[PDB]
Amino acid sequence: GSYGPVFVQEPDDVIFPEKKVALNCEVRGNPSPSYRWLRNGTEIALESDYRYSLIDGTFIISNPSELRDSGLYQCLATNSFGSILSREATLQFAYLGNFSGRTRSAVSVREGQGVVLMCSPPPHSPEIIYSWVFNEFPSFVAEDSRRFISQETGNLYISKVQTSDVGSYICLVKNAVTNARVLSPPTPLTLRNDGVMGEYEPKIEVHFPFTVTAAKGTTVKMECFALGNPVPTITWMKVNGYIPSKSRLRKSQAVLEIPNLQLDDAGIYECTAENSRGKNSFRGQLQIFTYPHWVQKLNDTQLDSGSPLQWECKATGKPRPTYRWLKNGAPLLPQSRVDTVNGILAIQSVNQSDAGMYQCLAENKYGAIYASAELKILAS
């Protein structure tokens, strides 16, 4: 019949590793709406670059470049009855360099001493996986409570070096997105002959961050590992609390994994490394937030030309989100007929000029959500 633009599909976040990027947008409306794409708040002119084509709201870039094309993209859909703006979608890029070609000096340690072999990975993105190899690939390093690989530092941690450990160690890096894979030069591991090392209490050489902030429903991995003789044992504890039963110990107790974060799971977490000569511990903080989510959106409304109007948006989230309103993609300033307090829109006596698309925003530090509806004015 006759109605303003309504979102059927909105842009999703995309990470580019066939050299093409596609950003999605689709709306239904009568007459058929036309689309417009912004980047970083400013409208893109599709003519300004031949790499930019558009196929039914779907924004496409052939030959994507990280510098030229990175940013936040939005979809501006309009017809005769008004305009609506989509959520901001991130366009970022995956990339993986090669290791340094320089020979890596032999590392010499006493028998029974612990060692930390440096990965020293190439320039890359946060979306990678570390891996180590003994002498030759694919002869991967056996992982246990004496040999641990940090997925945060990339380094290989060996607690109580013995004769069998003597050899060369090669670091590996796979980018999960691009699937690419690069290898380091060998690092020789040798044993001194200036006597051996005795027994000593464990020393934590890698741990999880002092502070982390994760979203509800996500998974967090907290690694903690020490160098000791005898080989340390690692135990976990929530300070003045409880390790949630849903959690699982991984990589020989060195990793505590808490799937499905809830506001409850927030708190201080302590790992403890221990042998027969003493203990050492580390405390880190985990705090959980939640993205904004709609409780009460705004629906389409018809209203007689002299009637009052009161629209209300209600949303959840931590921290509590704030609200701001749009009419046809443009902000609604105060000191005008259209009054807005938090998530409430009020007009004392509407009129024909007020007919158009309206949007409600709920937002906090971590995200902003949108809701739209058409306001029709029955004429006098």
Place of tokens 């409304």: 301
Q: Which residues pair with 147 in a beta bridge?
A: 158
Q: How far apart are CA 85 and CA 75, in angstroms?
A: 6
Q: Which two tokens stand for residue 275?
A: 């042998």
Strands 248-250 and 82-85: unpaired
Q: How far apart are CA 113 and CA 98, in angstroms?
A: 31
Q: Is 138 exposed, middle or buried (0-12, 13-18, 19+ CB in 10 A)?
A: exposed
Distances 84 to 29, 52, 77, 372, 374 between C-alpha atoms, Å: 11, 22, 5, 7, 10
Cβ–Cβ < 8 Å for 282, 207: yes
Q: How far apart are CA 64 and CA 47, in angstroms?
A: 16
Domains of the chain, each with CATH number or no CATH: 1-94 (2.60.40.10), 95-198 (2.60.40.10), 199-289 (2.60.40.10), 290-380 (2.60.40.10)
Q: How long is the chain?
A: 380
Q: How far apart are CA 64 and CA 45, in angstroms?
A: 16
Determined by which method? X-ray
Half-sphere exposure of 297 (CA within 13 A, CB side): 12
Q: Is 3 exposed, middle or buried (0-12, 13-18, 19+ CB in 10 A)?
A: middle
